[PDB]
Amino acid sequence: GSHMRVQVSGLSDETTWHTLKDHLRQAGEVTFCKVFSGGRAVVEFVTPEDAARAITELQASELEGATLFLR
């Protein structure tokens, strides 16, 4: 499922998983969304297309005042 997986960095201190999930629903359906230390998270989407759309169209987007980096 690596093709469906996106690594997120740059989250604000206050941002939790469901908020990130809602942000990324702009790109597609989210099947895994967990927040980790240092403003980071790992997300998986239903399809590789959704992951591609997130990286393509949501790169450096602001969430709760913080710019996200996607890879």
Residue numbers in the entry: 199 to 269
Sentences from the paper on this structure:
However, TbRGG2 does not contain the signature aromatic residues within its predicted RRM RNA binding motifs, raising the possibility that it may not adopt a canonical RRM fold. To address this question we determined crystal structures of the domain, which encompasses residues 203 to 269, from the T. brucei protein. Two apo RRM structures were obtained, one of the RRM(L209M) mutant, which was constructed to aid in crystallographic phasing and one of the WT RRM. Both structures were solved to 1.8 Å to final Rwork/Rfree values of 15.1%/18.7% and 16.5%/19.7%, respectively. The WT RRM structure contains four subunits in the crystallographic asymmetric unit (ASU) and the RRM(L209M) structure contains one. The RRM molecules in the two structures are essentially identical; the Cα atoms of the RRM in both structures can be superimposed with root mean square deviations (rmsds) of 0.4–0.6 Å. The structure shows that the TbRGG2 RRM indeed harbors the characteristic RRM fold composed of a five-stranded anti-parallel β-sheet surrounded by two α-helices (36–37). The TbRGG2 RRM structures revealed no interfaces significant enough to provide stable oligomerization, suggesting the domain itself does not oligomerize. Although the TbRGG2 RRM adopts an RRM fold, as noted it does not contain the conserved aromatic residues located on the RNP motifs, characteristic of canonical RRM proteins. Instead it harbors valine, arginine and glutamine residues in these positions.
